[PDB]
Amino acid sequence: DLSQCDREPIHLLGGIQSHGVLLAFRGPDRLLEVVSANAQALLGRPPETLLGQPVGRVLPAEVLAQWEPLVARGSVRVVLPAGAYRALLHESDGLTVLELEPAELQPGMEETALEVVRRLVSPLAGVKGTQALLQTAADTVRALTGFDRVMVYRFDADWHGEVLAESKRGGMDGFLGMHFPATDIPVQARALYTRNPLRLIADARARPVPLLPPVVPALGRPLDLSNSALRSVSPVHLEYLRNMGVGASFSLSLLKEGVLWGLIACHHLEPLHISHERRRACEVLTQLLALQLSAEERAAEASEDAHRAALLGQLATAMGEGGTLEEVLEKESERVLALTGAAGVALLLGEEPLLVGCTPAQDEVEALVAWLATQPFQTSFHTDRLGTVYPPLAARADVAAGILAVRLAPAAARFAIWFRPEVARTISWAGNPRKPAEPEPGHQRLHPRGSFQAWEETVRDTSLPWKRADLGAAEGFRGALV
Amino acid sequence: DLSQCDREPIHLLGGIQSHGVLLAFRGPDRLLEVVSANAQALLGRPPETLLGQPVGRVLPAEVLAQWEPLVARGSVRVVLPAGAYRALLHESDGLTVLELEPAELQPGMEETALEVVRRLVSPLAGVKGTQALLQTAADTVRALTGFDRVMVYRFDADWHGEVLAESKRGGMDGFLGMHFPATDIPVQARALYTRNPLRLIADARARPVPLLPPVVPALGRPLDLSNSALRSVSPVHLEYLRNMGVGASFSLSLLKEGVLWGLIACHHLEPLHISHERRRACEVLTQLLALQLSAEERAAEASEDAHRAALLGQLATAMGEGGTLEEVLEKESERVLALTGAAGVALLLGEEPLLVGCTPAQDEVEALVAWLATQPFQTSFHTDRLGTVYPPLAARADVAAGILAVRLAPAAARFAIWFRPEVARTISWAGNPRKPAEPEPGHQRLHPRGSFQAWEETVRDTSLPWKRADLGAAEGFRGALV
Ligand SMILES: */C=C/C1=C(C)C(=O)N/C1=C\C1=NC(=C\c2[nH]c(/C=C3\NC(=O)C(C=C)=C3C)c(C)c2CCC(=O)O)/C(CCC(=O)O)=C1C
């Protein structure tokens, strides 16, 4: 995309993380085709000497007696003299990958997850607010991971992050409310975090351990590690954590009706290894919250719309009552402007501008129309920064930063227009928004930014966002007048 | 009415189930005030030799040592000789209530409950419909308890009950789709379960265990067992049970937005007990269900209404493009019919009615038109049973079985009437509904009924009920008039 950022395929780096071991088999005699460089830490034999040998003459017997449970369910606890190891099974690039990983050792771990579901799942939950919602998910994952600091990290329509809630050990500082550049996580990450919702960086200060061969022969590329648990993340992002003063990361994607609604982030000053099962315990915690977020959002809009229908029905009974239309409007203005939460309205229903409330001048709205009487909007047209779509009213951010316009007739210049003032807004970016990184001599080898302090940009000349419940309300106002 | 199957003080029976012991101390020395009569089993002394004694002597070290956690978290496991029992501590009638009942003895239950959570959360459950969702639940809450049958049991607007999802053994006489009269779960019990969300009947044939003394000295009534888990239930439900040939039942209240939506049943034919832990595990299962529902419910009504105002505005572009109305309403005749999912629409805007579609004749709409304006409604108005209230039409259930009118102004008698024909429905109850219970001669005893075979009734004259979109489509269609 924009950079080489959005180019570096992160799943094809040929590097596992030093806390596990990777074995890759193929065919119907399950010969060994790729193996991680630290095999002998668990095996007792040089990796180089086991390539091209059957499963049965490589995997230790301890693992072999579990081979049937393994191929069945994908995951089984097996004991080697090394302790207890969670072995994972999954398919990749024409092979049956096996990854070995230190098992979980807290027995009542899973009971513990039952309780933090309970806090997160309850009814009368959020009665304090859909932010406590995010506050509790934050605390809950913390109480289950034992991490220093857990944040809930959402994407805006620019794909730029902000931390909506935080939960954090003392001595840890705070990035709550701070915003985060779009390229802090490029696209190839964003879509890979769309299928794979789990990810552990167990030691940002350790050395990614390579496979051997570094390439699948028939493929002349490394094995695809898109499904790997032991995948070593991108070195810049390792260099990024290191800037952050952090030595381990874990995050969980918040899928909500699909799109990444954001993440659940986890930082720990030292390294920490989190079992596969706790890792899964934590997944359901996200899934739940996304489900919690989903039921309250719908609810929130529901009431909003009803509260709007309150007005159209009283506006309506106001009408039909008596007088012409220039009559009820006079008395009705204090709901006419409420239908969309607006500050003034224009009305070109026939006679000269009937201007109500706080509004641009007659000639200015007699101009604004002519131009709006040329653009391709069908029934409704809303925009929250009019100054860049029509600079005639650029300077008038006082009353006409945001406009919402409805077409009260076919090819007719007859409309209504709701104006809305700007609302100043302070975004607290985490590092300089101008430079997300620092590009070396030769635009060649980027390097993440190591200053993560607050910046202070003031948003101006932009109204409040025209909500879902506004568009409905004005469309409703459309079918209401002559 | 208020049958004696409403008055039965269920929380005042005075006894417990045999699988557990109840102790109730009081004051600052916690002297034994009330104690179950099977207390020797777990103590070493006659129940009636322990009344009047401080808590320390009677209760054996095992549970004393763990007093502070039991108090704080409400319960604790406690390995006695008798067995791993799980003590439970609440307050009632001014007395601390200690309940012992035997505790879960299978290691990995919690892991197991976790995995079944991941069966109801899902990337998206109900993808096959709100049906899958329900069944899936009944599947889950059976795969974890082990009961021979589980059913989901929703209460209708009159607190009658119908079964809508059911998991059961092979060769198992199931009750899906069937309806159950509302006295099968009297009022008082629903208040209580509205308080107490879970309950066990481990042995339906077994017989309650006396409490000692019978009435709490200072009350002259027996201890309030409303927050009891060993609470024996009314004997008339136990008969009911054995009538159904069942041996152990278990039920979990389905609370959502504060309206007892229904109950997940459970029924084993040999007597079986589930531990509090395991039961608790099913509380999340029932808690998560309602959450998954509420979100689907809001969703669908959102999908719906948007469609409704889609045509409403399609009904408004109709407006400005034709100086016609009595024609416009006939060119797009059914767009108005299908705001309300209707058959035919009646308008008396002024002169002669504008009957359009399937609808009675002018000479009859006029009849329910005038008497109508003599009603106590104010904007919308509607029934599915036009007869019951308007007998001049109780025979035209073919075109006007339910109506939904809407005033078009304050005074003056102009409205729109949307009509629906009847739809016939054949629901099978479980046994006769006319004789839900059976009394001895003298009318102060009432057993349950002799059988629950499919007694089938066929509903005529009633249409489908007008839903939210219906009344909200119709309300916004009024507005677009005046
Ligand atoms: C009017 C009298 C009653 C009739 C008739 C009747 O059927 N019940 C009447 C009174 C009470 N019912 C109480 C509870 C209750 N009843 C049922 C129904 C069933 N249990 C089953 O096992 C089946 C089998 C398919 C059915 C239909 C239930 C589930 C309950 C709830 C109790 C539980 O969890 O088992 C009741 C109070 C009992 C209490 O004290 O909780 C009364 C007084």
Ligand SMILES: */C=C\C1=C(C)C(=O)N/C1=C\C1=NC(=C\c2[nH]c(/C=C3/NC(=O)C(C=C)=C3C)c(C)c2CCC(=O)O)/C(CCC(=O)O)=C1C
């Ligand atoms: C073009 C290169 C990049 C620049 C410049 C940059 O700033 N980031 C770049 C690339 C990637 N980021 C990736 C993943 C990723 N980023 C974040 C964002 C964070 N913001 C913060 O404040 C912190 C705090 C320490 C972080 C971590 C996050 C959360 C992730 C996901 C990883 C995780 O485990 O949380 C990636 C993808 C790497 C991969 O191999 O998957 C790239 C390339």
